[PDB]
């Protein structure tokens, strides 16, 4: 037994290098061990299991090995339970030990996935861990157990997680739990649907006590010392290092913790006020824009009304970020944050208004509607001078003219126009330019002449949905191209483009170009160009089915009439897609269709475009 | 501090009195290290006191009795809140209520301590508040400073139903319930039950009479 155990452990530890994985040796060893594992103790089996497993070795012999040892461990544990109520079953009580259960959880948790046998086995060891929980004294082992369960994608019973949290509470005195393991446990418990708020309260307390202890330690060091008695990039790095030293966590994860606490309804006084001065303020400059947005939404949900935090953030955004660099979403979130009447008025509201004007005038629907609502909320306050609202009046007139343009294009929904008109009516706005009156007259003509039905029949629903999805992908919070667009969003956009014909997509792209100039991202333009090229190439399109299998769908026969193809040529001329405009395949297909239909001017244009391309 | 939302002013004052009464004993401080820790705890205490004065300002906004503001200022000075702006608001509020107040209801010891707590410059700016505090401390109530926080809450604000009932109070409530269940026509049983109630009226809650009289109405 000992010789075979040593040999198999030596081979398993030698299999760390992929060059040392051999088929002959594994074929010699694994079945011989397979037939004799009924003579092996649970400790020996776990020692064999714990050694490193090669991927090929795991797929060829590892999975069945683990399943059989799991079955044997379940059998010996059942025998031990019956006793409490190859001679190994006779001594099953001693073999099944709490340390054995803990190491089994740690090892098989990170090695198993979403399987039925794994689920049953894990439920068995969870019941046995409930039986032997009280013996463990290091909460880090429980944290590792929770992480293993999270990897396994299996949710134990709620009472089990409550017991684990109570054990965390009990064991924390003897051995304090670190802030990073506390964060990991918090994420795991939130992901596995643990509703009980007490564990979240305890974990937040465990994080905050460590943070304030470190802050007090540095302050007492400074006080004892005094009793005895690119530069921007460098400052950002130093601030990040200080924050990581104090909180033992990256700023993004701290901000997402704060956002989670805000979502769960925790008070702002006990979780933002203590950390505002030492943590948030000095590290604010080095935050990534995603962390900026998360923190802004955290303050919004927390209903924070402390100018001590509000004013420096506005000062940083106005003087250290610049209007061109700050995403308008964060600016809108800040304006909503200062909107509520209970929020005291900061002394630098004019800076925020000027930044809003600069950002929303340099760039060039529902967004304008919400902007108008929050401007109304700001104007409701009596501490706002009229002259400071004078630029906001011009902003609202700009929005009115933009709606004047959108109503002519039959793109904007009339409900948003009604909401905007109601806003201007309840604001008693001084419509000096009169564009609001012209908008109301055009809305009256819409309601009287054609109606909403004819207005919505002016265009195609497919084009509208393609435009909406294109705008959503383009307006996704990439935070100034800081983060690449998600692969899941890429797949969703590709699926949306696949189900829609090329002509509708081109019409949507032309409408987007007309409405917004130079507002299309390079990635979305490349995606649209690839979709159109694949559609018109004749080689088919790659579609990801419900089984996640790539299938070559043949291109749909676009039955284009003479007028329809002339419109297609016009859209090709007016599209912002340079690749599509210069694509020889599209022009060749248009030439073929023109030859089949028999028009001469389109043929001449296609010939000239092909000559220029070649 | 965590579970403090929509705090009645009386309950906040009672909690402040409890915090004051549980203050640590003062000993000679080692000037090297542990006095630094003393200041380190003092700043946290001051932050908690700032959280408290937030609700104090809220209570000023909605409206509070003079007894509540006097007790809150007493406790805040005893713990230590040297802002000199909140005290200006306190003096302003007392000046607002100076005419519509009675010196025969407030506490003399509280008046002396709050007059000491409020700076002489603040009283110089507000003379009517100074006269009112002088009148209260010269003529008022004595003995309300040594009362336990629960006794202070009960005497100051009845109908709180926070502390558990004693045996005599529970017996009185049982008598009230049995009177309620009894029919109106049966005058003898009601007379007997009322006579039983008034035999222990001294040891029962004063506010509970509002229920007792109600039976006579129903």
């Amino acid at each position: 037994l000992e010789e075979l155990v040593e040999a198999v452990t030596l081979y398993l530890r030698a299999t760390k290098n992929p060059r040392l994985v051999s088929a002959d040796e594994e074929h010699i060893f694994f079945p011989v061990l397979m037939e004799r594992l009924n003579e092996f103790h649970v400790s020996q089996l776990l020692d064999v299991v714990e050694c490193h497993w090669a991927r090929s070795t795991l797929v060829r012999y590892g999975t069945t090995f683990k399943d059989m040892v799991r079955d044997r461990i379940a059998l010996i544990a059942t025998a031990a339970a019956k006793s409490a109520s190859d001679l190994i079953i006779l001594r099953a009580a001693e073999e099944m030990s709490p340390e054995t259960v803990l190491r089994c959880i740690i090892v098989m948790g990170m090695s198993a996935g979403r399987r039925k046998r794994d689920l049953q086995f894990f439920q068995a060891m969870g019941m046995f861990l409930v039986h032997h929980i009280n013996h463990y004294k290091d909460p880090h082992e429980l944290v590792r157990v929770l992480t293993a369960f999270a990897r396994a994608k299996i949710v134990p019973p709620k009472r089990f997680l409550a017991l684990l949290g109570r054990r965390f509470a009990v064991l924390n005195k003897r051995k304090k739990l670190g802030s990073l393991p506390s964060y990991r446990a918090f994420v795991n418990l939130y992901k596995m649907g643990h509703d009980q708020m007490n564990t979240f309260r305890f974990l937040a307390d465990c994080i905050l006590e460590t943070i304030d202890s470190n802050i007090k330690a540095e302050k007492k060091r400074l006080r004892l010392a005094q009793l005895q008695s690119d530069p921007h990039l460098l400052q950002n790095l130093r601030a990040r290092e200080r924050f990581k030293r104090l909180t033992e966590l990256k700023p993004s994860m701290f901000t997402k913790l704060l956002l989670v606490l805000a979502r769960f309804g925790a008070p702002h006084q006990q979780y933002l006020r203590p950390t505002t001065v030492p943590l948030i303020l000095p590290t604010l400059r080095a935050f990534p824009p995603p962390s900026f947005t998360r923190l802004l939404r955290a303050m919004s949900l927390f209903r924070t009304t402390d100018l001590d935090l509000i004013e420096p953030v506005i000062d940083f955004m106005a003087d250290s970020l610049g209007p061109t660099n700050v995403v308008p979403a964060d600016v809108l979130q800040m304006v909503r944050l200062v909107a509520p009447p209970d929020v005291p008025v900061p002394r630098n509201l004019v800076k925020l208004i000027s930044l809003c004007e600069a950002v929303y005038s340099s760039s060039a629907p529902g967004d304008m509607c919400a902007v108008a609502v929050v401007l109304l909320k700001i104007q409701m306050k009596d501490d706002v001078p009229l002259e400071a609202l004078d630029p906001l009046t011009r902003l609202m007139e700009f929005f009115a003219e933009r709606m004047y343009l959108l109503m002519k294009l039959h793109i904007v929904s009339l409900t948003h126009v009604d909401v905007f008109t109601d806003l201007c009516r309840q604001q008693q706005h001084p419509d000096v330019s009169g564009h609001i009156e012209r908008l109301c007259a055009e809305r009256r003509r819409v309601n009287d002449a054609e109606g909403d039905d004819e207005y919505y029949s002016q265009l195609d629903i497919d084009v509208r949905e393609t435009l909406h999805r294109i705008l959503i992908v383009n307006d996704y919070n990439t935070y100034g191209q800081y983060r690449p667009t998600p692969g899941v969003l890429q797949v969703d956009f590709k699926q949306a483009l696949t189900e829609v014909s090329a002509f509708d997509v081109l019409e949507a792209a032309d409408l987007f170009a007309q409405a917004f100039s130079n507002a299309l991202k390079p990635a979305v333009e490349r995606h649209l160009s690839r979709s159109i090229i694949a559609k018109l190439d004749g080689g088919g399109e790659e579609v990801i089915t419900e089984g996640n299998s790539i299938v070559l769908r043949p291109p749909r026969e676009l039955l284009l009439t003479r007028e329809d193809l002339g419109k297609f040529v016009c859209l090709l001329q007016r599209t912002p897609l340079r690749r599509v405009r210069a694509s020889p395949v599209v022009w060749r297909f248009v030439e073929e269709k023109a030859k089949k239909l028999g028009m001469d001017d389109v043929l001449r244009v296609v010939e000239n475009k092909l000559a220029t391309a070649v | 501090a965590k579970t403090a939302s929509d705090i009645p002013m009386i309950q906040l004052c009672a909690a402040l009195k409890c915090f004051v009464r549980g203050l640590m004993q003062n000993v000679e401080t080692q000037s090297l290290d542990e006095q630094v820790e003393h200041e380190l705890e003092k700043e946290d205490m001051d932050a908690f006191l700032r959280f408290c004065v937030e609700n104090l300002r809220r209570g000023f906004a909605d409206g509070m009795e003079v007894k509540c503001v006097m007790a809150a200022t007493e406790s805040l000075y005893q713990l230590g809140y040297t802002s000199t702006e909140f005290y200006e608001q306190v003096a302003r509020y007392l000046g607002s209520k100076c005419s519509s107040a009675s010196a025969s209801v407030n506490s003399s010891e509280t008046a002396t301590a709050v007059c000491l707590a409020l700076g002489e410059d603040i009283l110089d700016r507000h003379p009517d508040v100074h006269t009112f505090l002088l009148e209260v401390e010269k003529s008022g109530l004595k003995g309300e400073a040594s009362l336990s926080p629960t006794e202070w809450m009960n005497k100051n604000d009845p109908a709180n139903f926070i502390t558990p009932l004693t045996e005599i109070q529970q017996e009185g409530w049982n008598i009230i319930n049995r009177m309620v269940e009894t029919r109106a026509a049966d005058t003898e049983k009601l007379t007997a039950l009322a006579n039983e109630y008034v035999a222990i009226l001294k040891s029962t809650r004063v506010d509970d009479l509002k229920y007792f009289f109600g039976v006579f109405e129903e």
Binding site: - | D6, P8, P158, I176
Partner: peptide
Amino acid sequence: NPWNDGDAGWRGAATGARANRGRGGFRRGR
């Protein structure tokens, strides 16, 4: 709000402030 966890607290407590905002006459009696 999940953080409340089925605890009305001071808004649903027995304090005199909450007991002084109703006009029933206290006739039937609790």
